[PDB]
Amino acid sequence: AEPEHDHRKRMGLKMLLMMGLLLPLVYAMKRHKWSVLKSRKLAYRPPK
Amino acid sequence: VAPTLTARLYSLLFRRTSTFALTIVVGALFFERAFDQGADAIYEHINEGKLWKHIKHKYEN
Amino acid sequence: VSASSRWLEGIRKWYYNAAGFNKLGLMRDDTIHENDDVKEAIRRLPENLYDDRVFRIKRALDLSMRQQILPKEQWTKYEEDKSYLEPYLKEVIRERKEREEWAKK
Amino acid sequence: MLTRFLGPRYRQLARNWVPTASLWGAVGAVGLVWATDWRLILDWVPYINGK
Amino acid sequence: DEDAVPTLSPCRFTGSQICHREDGLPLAHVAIAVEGPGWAHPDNVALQVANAIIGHYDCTYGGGAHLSSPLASIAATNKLCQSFQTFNICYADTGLLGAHFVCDHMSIDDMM
Numbered sequence: 001a002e003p004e005h006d007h008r009k010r011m012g013l014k015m016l017l018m019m020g021l022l023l024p025l026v027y028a029m030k031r032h033k034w035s036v037l038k039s040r041k042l043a044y045r046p047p048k
Numbered sequence: 049v050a051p052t053l054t055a056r057l058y059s060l061l062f063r064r065t066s067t068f069a070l071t072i073v074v075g076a077l078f079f080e081r082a083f084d085q086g087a088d089a090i091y092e093h094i095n096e097g098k099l100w101k102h103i104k105h106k107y108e109n
Numbered sequence: 110v111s112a113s114s115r116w117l118e119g120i121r122k123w124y125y126n127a128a129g130f131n132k133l134g135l136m137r138d139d140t141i142h143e144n145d146d147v148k149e150a151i152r153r154l155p156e157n158l159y160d161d162r163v164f165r166i167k168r169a170l171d172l173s174m175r176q177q178i179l180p181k182e183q184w185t186k187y188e189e190d191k192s193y194l195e196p197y198l199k200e201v202i203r204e205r206k207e208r209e210e211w212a213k214k
Numbered sequence: 215m216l217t218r219f220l221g222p223r224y225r226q227l228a229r230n231w232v233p234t235a236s237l238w239g240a241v242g243a244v245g246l247v248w249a250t251d252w253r254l255i256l257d258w259v260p261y262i263n264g265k
Numbered sequence: 266d267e268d269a270v271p272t273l274s275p276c277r278f279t280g281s282q283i284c285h286r287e288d289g290l291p292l293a294h295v296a297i298a299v300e301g302p303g304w305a306h307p308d309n310v311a312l313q314v315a316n317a318i319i320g321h322y323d324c325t326y327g328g329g330a331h332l333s334s335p336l337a338s339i340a341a342t343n344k345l346c347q348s349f350q351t352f353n354i355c356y357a358d359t360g361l362l363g364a365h366f367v368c369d370h371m372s373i374d375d376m377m
Contacts, residue, residue: 066241069241
């Protein structure tokens, strides 16, 4: 029914180990560029 | 050596977007080897005798 | 004068706290949907109320971005909540409804 | 009609962008080498001849 | 003399942004800088040259399109500001090296 079986599970392991590197790294890449915005401090200074 | 090495990396390899790109490309070739090695070998070790790569010796020539 | 109208008030104060715009320093009039009637009443706001309004919203969208909330101290007390827009908004709709009756004859 | 571009400044400015342009072909070829698995070249590389 | 004369501490450069937004004012002032080496350093001479090449502009400058400086030329042709100036302020062991300008609200990007 499914000769690809062991080939697909092999790619799956890679997919799992690859995502396991990339997801933290892509996250670390976003977290960086938003770090400017995430730590910005507002002050309002109107007259009187 | 253990602190001033991210530094050494950056000067030599990361400043120039050429050497940056060269590093990622040179670095990717070496990674594709080491990964398709290691992970295939991880995948080997989790079956150990389910696969025709191990059976091979049974039916000779 | 009344036990029960203090209760409708307690229901109202509940829903207010429950809505939780307060939690991001907002006032009820900061939260209103901008339609044409609303848009104009913002136009009509005096300098200070306008500048205060832009700051409240700016502070809130900032919190909303960082998924946070004010100190409970710094939230907007239900009683302390001024319907600064109300009279303007009412005057706008009032003017529009006039134009609408005139358009009918 | 490219007579315009022949003078001292232009040769300084080419001479400026030369080490960069050098490395950009290094990037581009080695990428093509890796992406096609060029066989002919890659046999030379220790480690990477996995056969 | 003898008691509690201290030397200056070194000053940490951040690199960082301060934006004080006020649309009631008719033109924008931006001032951008990287960190300078300060008074002593031979690099001041060379930086000052590079600065000189970028130079300065002002809308009262005689003859605009034909200015040597590619900043100042494009600035004048495309009416991209009212003023700019390069600078290198020195302190002991540090300083501010960059430029400051002044322009319309729709120039701030192009000028940048």
